[PDB]
Amino acid sequence: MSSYTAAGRNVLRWDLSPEQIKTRTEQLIAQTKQVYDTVGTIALKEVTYENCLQVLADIEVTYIVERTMLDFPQHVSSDREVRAASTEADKKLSRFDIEMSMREDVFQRIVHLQETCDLEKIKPEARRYLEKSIKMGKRNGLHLSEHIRNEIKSMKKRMSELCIDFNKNLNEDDTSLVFSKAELGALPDDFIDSLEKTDEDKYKVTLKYPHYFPVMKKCCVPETRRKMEMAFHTRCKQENTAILQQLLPLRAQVAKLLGYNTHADFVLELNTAKSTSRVAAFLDDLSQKLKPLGEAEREFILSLKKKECEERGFEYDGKINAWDLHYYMTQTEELKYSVDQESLKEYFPIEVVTEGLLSIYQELLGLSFEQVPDAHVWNKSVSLYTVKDKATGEVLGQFYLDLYPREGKYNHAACFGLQPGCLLPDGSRMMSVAALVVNFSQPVAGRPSLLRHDEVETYFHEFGHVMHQICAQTDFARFSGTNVERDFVEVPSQMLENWVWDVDSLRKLSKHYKDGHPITDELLEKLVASRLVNTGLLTLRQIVLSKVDQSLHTNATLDAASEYAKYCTEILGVAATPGTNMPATFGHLAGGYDGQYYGYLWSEVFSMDMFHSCFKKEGIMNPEVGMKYRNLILKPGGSLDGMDMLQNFLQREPNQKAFLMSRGL
Ligand SMILES: [Zn+2]
């Protein structure tokens, strides 16, 4: 199938029944294992590029594609039965994945292939394929004695359970409090009316994010904010503190058995940050550069508290408590820019944001987006688009847009890679496929869907991931799409966010939904100028969490809560509430990417360097720079190291000057 059409290149089924999902899973696992069994039995002396590397590579592509039809419905299907089947399928397939990665026999074949192979004869990406494959095996201990390999098993096992147990507790928790209307002063009528009422003139308030934050940010009653913050940071205190006490030491031992000093170093080796000392130097120096901004903001907030405590007859303690930060930061936003979010949204009808976003990406990346007429989708609200290179007509891929909240649908924003843009056996290329999943306000009371500014920002972010997935073209499935370093994956996304804080871009994404008049220049200038409100404390807060993260995987004998409290006073200047245990509620530790929390801030520094040093310098809609970004940063996917791609694009090593300049540091 030609690279200049979408015909027949996307046959993913989105209407499979529970029984079919179950059957296909059984068959995919069984048939895929036969392939690894075959490679695992090749006589070492007869291992070749064709019967070993090529076979492993071909099966990796086939498996990944079939697997998406089975593990994606759990996130978008309208049928609960289908979703449950998908969840089960993902669980079996995830276990199988671990099984195959622990194959000693297959590993031996790849190691011996590299020994006798003349790397200069094959392509660079293939060398990286072997290199990375052997590296992963060693990271699983496939080069060690059976005794050590087994001990590493009964350990990677527990740490998996302990993490599911940690998460389960938090998720299951149903802690609740009851406050009177008076105790919830300053909270909007809409908020209170959404609350359950008791056999008293009391309202029920849970600790889930939808209740917790509006209260910590708007409730003028300090004592209420206080109890809410205390209950929130003591959730599963015992259960999870005990889990963390077994878990962190387990991570230490496993790292040692594998030849690493700490778990942090084990984790960091696969990231562009490379090491623990580098991450520490990154964070330490950043908090130093932010110290003066944090002091000023903290000073300003403290004066607001002292002034309010007077105007309200409230007692004063001269300090910013944990349950005070959210409130006063909100006050700061209101006093310095006062942007009526609910008013501004009227200028962002989803039709307009969508057409503008696409129009902008088309021009910048030299692409054309065309909506597929009668597309096969998982829900009628989903639209499908074909992506062609404007100049050549090449069909790079297709992307789906699933924009509204729906029962059973993933409730957070994300981009799912569904098909890799890698080479197929015949040398033809597989068409890349992505799904943009977000939950934007649906139309109500006769008004179209109206997006708040932060939603437009999320839209650009997620679309940044989609372009990465679609423009990425590699020889191997494992290096395709967004398969780059974990502390590099948010580079394409955070850089695109800058466009929603650009006056002229904003002009293309807005029009009043009613009469269609534009956003006044006065409002636009106010909007962009407001971007960095509270950055000092917000950033320092993210550094503290990043430090706690590194610490929990560097020294597994220290007390989490104490480490957290230490960094709070030293870096944020806001004390952790005595008796609470934030780390015990830090879902990021157990499941997810523990040891990688610093990645988001690390990515932002990099994206800021590319945006200011290149786009700002040449004009953010300059096609030249746009194509350079697409070709040097997106197209290579994970077939090249993150730092090398940055350097190719920048023509120099990256640095944080641009990032610091933005903050006025
Ligand atoms: Zn992202």
Side-chain angles (χ1 to χ4, degrees), residues 106-382:
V106 171
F107 173 71
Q108 273 183 36
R109 275 66 196 178
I110 298 178
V111 169
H112 278 63
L113 169 63
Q114 189 188 60
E115 308 183 328
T116 74
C117 192
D118 175 45
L119 290 62
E120 283 306 301
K121 271 293 182 179
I122 65 180
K123 294 181 177 177
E125 199 184 314
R127 298 173 202 162
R128 186 185 176 76
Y129 180 81
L130 275 182
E131 186 77 295
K132 293 296 178 182
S133 293
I134 292 175
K135 186 62 170 180
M136 291 303 269
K138 291 193 172 185
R139 281 172 64 81
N140 281 314
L142 304 186
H143 62 301
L144 309 186
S145 69
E146 280 202 12
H147 179 66
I148 304 176
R149 281 229 293 286
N150 292 323
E151 278 200 39
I152 289 181
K153 180 174 186 175
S154 49
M155 294 185 142
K156 274 188 177 181
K157 130 213 166 190
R158 292 200 54 54
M159 305 184 298
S160 202
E161 312 179 311
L162 286 170
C163 287
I164 304 308
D165 211 358
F166 185 93
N167 284 154
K168 179 177 72 70
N169 302 330
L170 296 174
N171 297 307
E172 303 189 322
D173 171 271
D174 62 355
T175 297
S176 182
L177 295 174
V178 293
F179 299 87
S180 63
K181 164 77 183 188
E183 299 177 298
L184 298 178
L187 288 188
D189 282 346
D190 279 11
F191 180 75
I192 288 178
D193 290 347
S194 71
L195 304 175
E196 213 171 300
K197 202 157 188 183
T198 63
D199 62 353
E200 302 179 59
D201 210 357
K202 292 291 198 306
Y203 302 79
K204 207 166 302 177
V205 182
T206 67
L207 290 309
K208 302 308 180 178
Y209 293 28
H211 287 177
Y212 184 63
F213 295 101
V215 170
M216 297 303 297
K217 295 176 187 176
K218 305 178 195 172
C219 186
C220 69
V221 186
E223 175 73 314
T224 297
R225 300 202 302 267
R226 181 175 197 163
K227 301 303 170 280
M228 282 295 275
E229 193 269 316
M230 174 53 101
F232 183 85
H233 290 133
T234 57
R235 289 137 63 216
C236 311
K237 188 181 184 182
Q238 182 205 64
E239 316 88 284
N240 286 0
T241 284
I243 286 177
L244 284 178
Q245 283 173 178
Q246 305 177 69
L247 190 54
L248 306 182
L250 277 184
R251 285 173 169 172
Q253 296 171 55
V254 172
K256 283 302 194 62
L257 298 182
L258 290 174
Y260 294 77
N261 298 309
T262 63
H263 178 69
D265 287 301
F266 174 74
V267 175
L268 282 44
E269 177 181 53
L270 306 187
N271 290 104
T272 57
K274 294 180 170 306
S275 66
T276 304
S277 54
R278 183 65 183 73
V279 169
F282 170 67
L283 304 178
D284 293 0
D285 301 2
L286 216 61
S287 52
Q288 202 64 195
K289 258 70 171 59
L290 290 166
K291 198 180 182 181
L293 192 50
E295 296 171 315
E297 294 187 6
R298 224 142 57 214
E299 186 179 308
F300 179 90
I301 281 175
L302 206 50
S303 65
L304 289 181
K305 181 178 184 181
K306 182 172 174 290
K307 172 180 181 175
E308 191 172 306
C309 288
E310 295 179 358
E311 312 175 316
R312 281 174 172 279
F314 283 163
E315 191 171 63
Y316 183 55
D317 61 4
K319 61 184 177 179
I320 296 176
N321 302 289
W323 61 87
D324 293 323
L325 191 51
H326 269 142
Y327 185 67
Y328 289 105
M329 285 184 101
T330 296
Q331 307 274 66
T332 299
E333 300 186 300
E334 299 183 60
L335 277 62
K336 300 197 171 187
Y337 301 87
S338 183
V339 170
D340 198 328
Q341 295 302 321
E342 292 307 294
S343 176
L344 186 66
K345 68 153 54 278
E346 280 172 35
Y347 292 83
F348 296 119
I350 199 165
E351 295 182 64
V352 178
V353 182
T354 288
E355 179 271 305
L357 174 160
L358 298 183
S359 175
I360 283 175
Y361 275 82
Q362 279 185 154
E363 175 177 352
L364 180 75
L365 307 176
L367 304 166
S368 74
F369 302 142
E370 171 155 60
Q371 174 165 17
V372 178
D374 300 273
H376 176 234
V377 294
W378 46 88
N379 185 279
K380 70 181 182 70
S381 190
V382 183

Side-chain angles (χ1 to χ4, degrees), residues 54 57-59 61-62 422-428:
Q54 195 66 58
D58 295 338
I59 197 54
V61 177
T62 67
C422 61
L423 297 181
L424 292 174
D426 49 293
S428 64

Side-chain angles (χ1 to χ4, degrees), residues 413-415 458 461-462 464-465 489-494 497 600:
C415 172
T458 293
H461 175 113
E462 255 28 75
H465 284 307
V489 311
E490 295 306 321
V491 169
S493 52
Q494 298 190 86
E497 290 181 359
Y600 208 71

Side-chain angles (χ1 to χ4, degrees), residues 485-498:
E485 300 84 348
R486 288 307 82 179
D487 61 9
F488 192 77
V489 311
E490 295 306 321
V491 169
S493 52
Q494 298 190 86
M495 192 187 86
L496 262 296
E497 290 181 359
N498 292 290

Side-chain angles (χ1 to χ4, degrees), residues 1-3 9 394 420-424 426-431 472-475:
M1 283 154 272
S2 163
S3 292
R9 294 218 281 160
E394 180 183 357
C422 61
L423 297 181
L424 292 174
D426 49 293
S428 64
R429 184 180 296 290
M430 169 154 264
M431 180 174 70
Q473 300 188 309
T474 61
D475 295 352

